[PDB]
Amino acid sequence: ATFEIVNRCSYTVWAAASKGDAALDAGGRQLNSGESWTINVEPGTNGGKIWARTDCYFDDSGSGICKTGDCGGLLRCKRFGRPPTTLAEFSLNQYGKDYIDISNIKGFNVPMNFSPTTRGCRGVRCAADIVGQCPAKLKAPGGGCNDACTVFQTSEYCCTTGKCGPTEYSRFFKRLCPDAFSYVLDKPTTVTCPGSSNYRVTFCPT
């Protein structure tokens, strides 16, 4: 499947694409304002994610650091990034269907739209000013709005026992972005698309 990744933000982001134990395509790239990056993702990929990183510095070997979404100090991510990270999540060609969603379970850094470019399903968006409105206890110094699990590390926020409810913190993310996951056992906002659909991820869509 093809994914087009577009940076419509007024600032540079460093896009990342990974399935946790390996890079998808090149795994990461700088995107100046307005730039588009097209990647190819193998059919059958389970548990892929795309995210943006902000305020990165890399050397000529591709080693460095970012203030949000850092993936072990590499430009080309093999592994998932450090919160806070707005997440585009996908599983492809699962018994004839693709499944897509946006998640705030690992916090929020950049607004995002995740839409199909082929027919047969709808897209999803989280484009509210979560960073601006972020509760004081969840604000990350480097930028962005952390999830409550990352900050407090409790069984209730992290849903460790498989039993957990919504919280004052999860309800904040849900209020601003109803179509994204706000906690692990949230009512699913997953969208079902035809198998082998193609997609576009836009940072700062509005």
Curated annotation (Swiss-Prot):
Its main location: cytoplasm. Keywords: Cytoplasmic vesicle, Disulfide bond, Signal, Taste-modifying protein. The keyword NADP does not apply. It is found in: Cytoplasmic vesicle. PROSITE patterns: THAUMATIN_1, THAUMATIN_2. Pfam families: Thaumatin. One of its GO terms (cellular component) is cytoplasmic vesicle. CDD domains: TLP-P. Disulfide bonds join C9-C204, C56-C66, C71-C77, C121-C193, C126-C177, C134-C145, C149-C158, C159-C164. The keyword Disulfide bond applies. Belongs to the thaumatin family. Taste-modifying protein; intensely sweet-tasting. It is 100000 times sweeter than sucrose on a molar basis. This is Thaumatin I.
